[PDB]
Scaffold this active site. Structure first.
Site, mmCIF file in Angstrom:
data_model
loop_
_atom_site.group_PDB
_atom_site.id
_atom_site.type_symbol
_atom_site.label_atom_id
_atom_site.label_comp_id
_atom_site.label_asym_id
_atom_site.label_seq_id
_atom_site.Cartn_x
_atom_site.Cartn_y
_atom_site.Cartn_z
ATOM 1 N N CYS A 241 0.774 -1.261 0.000
ATOM 2 C CA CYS A 241 0.000 0.000 0.000
ATOM 3 C C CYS A 241 0.806 1.314 0.000
ATOM 4 O O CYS A 241 0.497 2.232 -0.757
ATOM 5 C CB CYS A 241 -1.024 0.008 1.151
ATOM 6 S SG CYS A 241 -0.311 0.068 2.797
ATOM 7 N N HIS B 192 -2.755 0.700 7.000
ATOM 8 C CA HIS B 192 -3.024 0.928 5.581
ATOM 9 C C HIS B 192 -2.967 2.428 5.288
ATOM 10 O O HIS B 192 -3.217 3.244 6.171
ATOM 11 C CB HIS B 192 -4.376 0.298 5.166
ATOM 12 C CG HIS B 192 -4.738 0.513 3.719
ATOM 13 N ND1 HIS B 192 -3.930 0.110 2.672
ATOM 14 C CD2 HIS B 192 -5.820 1.098 3.149
ATOM 15 C CE1 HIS B 192 -4.508 0.428 1.525
ATOM 16 N NE2 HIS B 192 -5.659 1.034 1.788
ATOM 17 N N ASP C 294 -7.315 5.336 -3.558
ATOM 18 C CA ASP C 294 -6.577 4.242 -2.888
ATOM 19 C C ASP C 294 -6.313 3.197 -3.941
ATOM 20 O O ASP C 294 -7.184 2.434 -4.232
ATOM 21 C CB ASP C 294 -7.437 3.625 -1.786
ATOM 22 C CG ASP C 294 -6.724 2.520 -1.060
ATOM 23 O OD1 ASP C 294 -5.484 2.240 -1.349
ATOM 24 O OD2 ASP C 294 -7.342 1.881 -0.201
#
Length: 267
Positions: free
Chosen positions: A68, A107, A122
């Protein structure tokens, strides 16, 4: 010094270069199709660097993927270079089953301010990659090139959810506290080096496509159609699935097969 040209070539984007919603949508769709989610480096015990030169070397020039922070830092730099107003956020992962009531803020995602409206973006969630930016409006069901998503507002957080199997399933929960590179670098260190990180004990990979999503968790390959399951029985098969099917780079094949045995992913 971010190389916008090289980045857009890495993701196959030939459209207009401006800070528009149409552009944000095309980038959000193109990025997770072109750049896989993967933890090859952490799984092999190699460090993940978040500084911009290291990110471009690995992902853009080197053709690799990442998890991420690598995905969203990269996306953030590109959006900033295109003239978007963008900030970092952090989220606690709810997807799947945890041994914690409250999970860590493990995250990263992004907020993008467009004509005075807030979107989240995202392109780096491993569980289920979002393929469009989402308006930060609680309750509202929002169409994407894949599943519908929605954000719900709880007592003191937002929860991002996707419509999967007829259910609204929570990916993660977040507030609007701003995050900087230094904050991510701490979490990154934990996730890429702690024996307690699942990013060290197993392989996690994903890639989006037009008609489908690919997901690998350990020895389970799933293809989600706009849902085939294969159980991978051997290290060689895992490596061929990663490299062939998913377009993922394994920089040290024998260290890979050796790690697959230590972790018993396949055993």
């Amino acid at each position: 010094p971010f190389d916008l040209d090289a980045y857009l070539a890495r993701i196959g984007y030939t459209g207009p270069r401006n800070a528009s919603l149409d552009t944000l949508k095309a980038l959000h769709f193109a990025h997770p199709q072109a750049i896989p989610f993967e933890n090859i480096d952490p799984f092999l015990g190699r460090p993940v660097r978040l500084d911009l030169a290291a990110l471009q070397d690995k992902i853009v020039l080197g053709g690799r993927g990442g998890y991420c922070f690598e995905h969203n830092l990269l996306f953030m730099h590109a959006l900033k270079a295109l003239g978007f107003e963008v900030g970092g956020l952090a989220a606690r992962v709810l997807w799947g089953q945890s041994e914690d009531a409250i999970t860590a803020r493990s995250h990263m995602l992004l907020r993008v301010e467009l004509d005075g409206r807030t979107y989240i973006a995202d392109v780096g969630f491993g569980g289920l990659t979002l393929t469009a930016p989402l308006l930060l409006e609680p309750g509202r069901e929002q169409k994407t090139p894949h599943e519908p998503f929605r954000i719900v507002e709880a007592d003191d957080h937002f929860r991002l959810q996707a419509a999967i199997g007829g259910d609204w399933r929570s990916l993660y929960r977040f507030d609007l506290q701003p995050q900087y590179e230094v904050d991510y670098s701490v979490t990154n260190y934990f996730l890429s080096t702690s024996p307690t990180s699942h990013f060290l004990s197993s392989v996690i990979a994903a890639r989006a496509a037009p008609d489908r999503r690919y997901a690998l968790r350990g020895n389970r390959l799933s293809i989600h159609h706009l849902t085939e399951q294969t159980e991978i029985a051997t290290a060689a098969d895992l490596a061929d699935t990663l490299q062939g099917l998913l377009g993922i780079i394994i920089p040290d094949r024998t260290a890979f097969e050796a790690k697959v045995r230590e972790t018993k992913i396949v055993e």
